[model samples]
Target: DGEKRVQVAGVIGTNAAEVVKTAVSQLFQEYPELVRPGGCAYTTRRYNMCVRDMNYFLRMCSYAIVAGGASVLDERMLAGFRDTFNSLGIPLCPTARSIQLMKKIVKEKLATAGMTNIAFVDEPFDYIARVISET
Candidate 1:
């Protein structure tokens, strides 16, 4: 089989994406408040789109951490998300909080999973926090 070589960060491992994806479901399961009527996700005119986009964001974030570690998740990405919300006519403050909620929920799931090295969970949250602050 002919295959092209690809450059990548292998630390988070191939399973990391799946693991973070699982955590994404848990994010909604544990924190539906973030999507409620008075919640950040609902603050946008396209509420459904917000939900859909958030889901996609988290999925991409998961893969980001898996493929390149938390450090790779840059402020530009966060700023881009803020710009996305600005375009949607949503406020960044609440959305930032909602993003934090996503981090918390996912971390909780990881802890509950009983990983001996659950510290890995914090990296993504830190990445998110770092990004949120810049944006």
Candidate 2:
């Protein structure tokens, strides 16, 4: 199980960039207003920041996967992430949606790579989504 976890994390880490781009693209498509003038993803700078943050989430999840648990993720990433977003006035729903999309994309990538026991990947993504979406 541990070896498979590392293997799955390896697949995700190898494809992190593509996964982030695809997930963010789908997010912008689903929420067109996000790219409008007053939205979080308005300018090129903000757009890239969105991508950067998504990649951060993916990296953190990958860490948790390789460790075979989410403790590192919870302690390192989630500890203050939600508060930071809130301080920035970022809407949590769309962020949660992006994480969920990444989960879907990551699973597809694993499936394509012939990885079967990929269920562990869901925990970190779902945990992040739930944490950020909390009111």
Candidate 3:
């Protein structure tokens, strides 16, 4: 058999760090079984790293927001992420309404329970650009 490859069913924004973060969150939420939260066993560091870091960024930001509370953060950035990703895809996944309803709960409940600290930085486009420049 040929070497296994992580099928990138979609690839729009692996361009910027924050956009990469948004795309990954959407991808994982849209396809959880294929994409685990913490990490993946795939060989494609480019693809897997994007997912891992995006998730980590969200969780960590969630923690900072919760800990700050009214004194520190706003709830809507929580909503911002939810809406942002949902708005990105065609027809969107989970539906805008479903995401709107569940988002508050996802952020609030998770933060209240002290669940944070997850993402990291991968920066793939720079690599792509570097490869192109070198070649």
Candidate 4:
């Protein structure tokens, strides 16, 4: 959870992560349990909403690429995502640097907390699906 928060902040804009980071930082601060090594447990996680919304935002960016909205820039998916969010007229913001910024905050915080060595577990998607289908 900590590492995900760290990396997620790095990849996305800090504004995009303001809510999440505030929550995570507060959680760590309020709980003294994390002071001990191995006292806290975490799993690698992704924000499903962010993934979905970011994809949707890029849906517009993709549209922009088709609409001749970019020049001197490759039509990267990240660009599309940024553009999509921008076209929405959502406040004064630099959509271009949002996701990556969010991801950075995540990475820096994890390093500061010394949780960079956190383990990653790989589970076969098919296996998990089969188990869930049975239930």
Candidate 5:
């Protein structure tokens, strides 16, 4: 398990950019309004920030994966994530969807890398999605 965990994290880290870009591209396709005028991610700056934030989430998840737990995510990333998004007027459902999308992308990436047992990888992403979707 330990060896597999490390290997899985390495795979994700190596393909982090592709994972995030593909997920966000799919997200924009599903939520086209998100990039429309007057939308949260309408401007070029906001769009870039959106992708950067997704990458950050993936990076943190990789850390959690290698460490065999989500303590790093809870302490560092989730501490004020909900409030920050709320204050910024970012919709939670789409945000949650983005995490879920990343989860799917990462799983597929791992599978292509010959890593079949990927149930553990769902932990951090699912937890983040659930927490952010909460009222």
Candidate 6:
């Protein structure tokens, strides 16, 4: 009985995850800087590389939620991200903005799904800011 219940829950969670992913991608379109050749532009003009980067950040936030809330977004990881962007000649703000928008978009999407409690998953944005400033 427990196994079957767990399986059912997994299916529901998977569906919810898909919903959130779609919502994130859709909402991401609103941020033109994220894809254009400006602050958020990629170093290469490769095909759909910009979209892939946005998806990567979205995936990061999703995993960060499961790894232990937003606390998992620590200084080391953020610093790595910052340094990598600088080394690549990419704008750090675009990456930062993607994560920020991902947080808010996930919250709103989950709430719409009637999963208000899921918001705690991205609750540590303030901590993220503090760490960024210190870095």
How close to the true structure is residue 53 of candidate 6, measured as C-alpha lDDT?
A: 63
Candidate 1 lDDT, 62-131, residue by residue in tens: 6665554655666677778767766755655545554566655555555554433444445565566556
Estimate, for each residue in 1-135, the C-alpha lDDT of model 5 and write its tens digit: 889889988888888889888998899899998899866689999989899988887887788878887766664457488889899888888888988999999898888878885798998888777778887
lDDT of 2 at 54: 91
Greater-TM-score candidate between 2 and 5: 2
Q: Output the number of the TM-score-best candidate.
A: 2
| Candidate 2 lDDT trough over 10 residues, lowest sum | 70-79
lDDT of 3 by residue, 9-112 (tens): 01111222444444445555655633443334224664564445344443433333334322233345534554544454212322232223223334333345
Off by over 4 Å in 5: 75-79
lDDT of 4 at 56: 39
lDDT of 1 at 58: 60
Model 1 alpha-carbon drift over 4 Å, by segment: 1-45, 74-77, 133-135
**Where does candidate 6 stray beyond 4 Å?**
1-47, 71-74, 124-135
Q: What lDDT, from 0 to 1, does candidate 2 have?
A: 0.86
Model 1 residue 134 lDDT score:
59
Write down the TM-score for model 2.
Answer: 0.93
For all candidates in order, the CA lDDT equals 0.52, 0.86, 0.34, 0.34, 0.84, 0.52
- RMSD, every candidate, angstroms: 7.2, 1.4, 18.0, 18.3, 1.5, 5.5
Lowest-lDDT window of 10 residues in candidate 1? 1-10
User: Which ranges of candidate 4 are over 4 A from the true structure?
Assistant: 1-19, 23-75, 91-101, 115-135
Model 4 per-residue lDDT tens digits across residues 64-128: 22333333234354344445534643211322223223334444554564555422211111222
TM-score, structure 5 vs. true: 0.92
> Candidates' TM-scores?
0.55, 0.93, 0.25, 0.26, 0.92, 0.57
Clashes of each: 0, 0, 3, 22, 0, 0
Output the better candidate (2/6) by TM-score.
2
Q: Model 2, range 4-75, lDDT digits (tens) per residue?
A: 888888888899899999999899999988899877899999988999989988887888788877766654
